[PDB]
């Protein structure tokens, strides 16, 4: 199944990922397709930050849910 990651700009990116995948995996895919540093990425869905350790299935992400991207300079 597929999901959408969306920078506030409007730049929508389509990523194939399965429910039982950690946030770390998604981060790795996003950064692989764009070039972001792994640490700089903070995924936010419905106003809550997604913990690297947990999975998408723990947050009940549907087909084509929008996981907005926020970038942490740090």
């Amino acid at each position: 199944m597929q999901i959408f990651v969306k920078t506030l700009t409007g730049k929508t990116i389509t990523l194939e990922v399965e429910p039982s995948d950690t946030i770390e995996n998604v981060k790795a895919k996003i950064q692989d397709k764009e070039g972001i540093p792994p640490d700089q990425q903070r995924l936010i869905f419905a106003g809550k930050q997604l913990e690297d350790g947990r999975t998408l299935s723990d947050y009940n992400i549907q087909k084509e849910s929008t996981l907005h991207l926020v970038l942490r300079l740090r």
Binding site: M1, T7, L8, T9, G10, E18, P19, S20, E34, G35, I36, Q40, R42, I44, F45, A46, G47, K48, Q49, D58, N60, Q62, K63, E64, T66, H68, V70, L71, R72, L73, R74
Partner: protein
């Protein structure tokens, strides 16, 4: 009553998959006496599993709450509500189960909970699995994984292996003809609010209330829960703890909920938005750092204390 005839897939312990279509009123014992000569096993040997329960030999096929192109399994041994991506309107959901270790189905569940029960937690019950010659073991792991449930839309054709939907646990059939608070209009399908008083609202009012509290960024913020809504009456500790209910509203009305939630999260957590038009990029800069870049974006540098171009001198106006 369109067709009546049902078509069903059957996945055995072995890799083979068998497509068989039946009439909804055949005995499950008969189905066993049909599957047995299908693979060559004896009729006395076959145990059939579906959604976790050891199927009664006498029960009717139609009784099983079964849709189309669904899957049952076999072995030689001897009123829900969900939101669908394809179906915008919420549909009656069906409950299936999958093994945590091998990510497969066809296992027996120990408790079989009816309704209004403790559920939706990663760790609950362990069960025996058929796949991989009964090799689903937790004895070695120590860290305990468990049989986990999932829901499917029952109004249309489904893909048995991985199809799922969002469960809306706050939506019930009006079994006691309870009137909606907002309209005093008894609706067959309603939503129950998490407060003590058990306030209830129909779907029209869910939508109107949401889309009214939405344009002005009025969603109450809880860290763990998310950006949710308070009770219509404003009852304490009555925040919708599963957000997906908002999907009752369509693309615009809900995606904008997502966007606004993200923006407000960025704003309150200390992060700053992007001033360059049509960027809105939220960049969580380390509190002390005061040079703002736009990571993988418009690279415009602003003071953050002025929302203007990068200036060395302090911004007085």
């Amino acid at each position: 009553y369109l067709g009546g005839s049902l078509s069903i897939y059957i996945k055995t312990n072995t890799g083979r998959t068998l497509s068989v279509n039946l009439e909804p009123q055949w005995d499950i014992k008969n189905v066993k006496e049909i599957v047995a000569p299908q693979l060559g096993l004896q009729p006395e040997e076959v145990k059939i599993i579906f959604a976790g329960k050891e199927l009664s030999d006498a029960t009717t096929i139609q009784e099983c709450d079964l849709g189309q192109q669904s899957i049952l399994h076999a072995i030689r041994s001897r009123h829900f509500f969900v939101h669908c991506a394809q179906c915008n309107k919420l549909c009656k959901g069906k409950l299936r189960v999958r093994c945590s270790l091998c990510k497969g189905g066809a296992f027996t569940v120990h408790r079989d909970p009816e309704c209004w029960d403790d559920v939706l937690k990663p760790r609950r019950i362990t069960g025996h699995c058929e796949s991989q010659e009964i090799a689903c073991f937790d004895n070695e792991t120590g860290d305990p994984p468990f049989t986990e449930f999932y829901f499917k839309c029952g109004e249309h054709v489904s893909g048995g292996e991985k199809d799922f939907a969002a469960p809306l646990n706050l939506i019930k059939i009006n079994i006691k003809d309870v009137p909606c608070l907002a309209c005093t209009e008894v609706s067959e399908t309603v939503l129950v609010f998490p407060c003590e008083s058990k306030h209830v609202t129909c779907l029209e009012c869910f939508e109107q209330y949401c889309r009214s509290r939405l344009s002005e960024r009025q969603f109450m913020p809880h860290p763990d829960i998310g950006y949710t809504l308070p009770c219509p009456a404003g009852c304490e500790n009555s925040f919708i703890e599963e957000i997906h209910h908002f999907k009752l509203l369509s693309r615009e009305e809900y995606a904008r909920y997502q966007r606004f939630a993200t923006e407000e999260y960025v704003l309150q957590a200390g992060g700053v938005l992007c001033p360059q038009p049509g960027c809105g990029m939220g960049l969580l800069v380390e509190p002390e750092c005061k040079k703002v870049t736009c990571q993988n974006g418009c690279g415009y540098v602003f003071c953050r204390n002025c929302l203007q171009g990068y200036h060395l001198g302090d911004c007085l106006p």
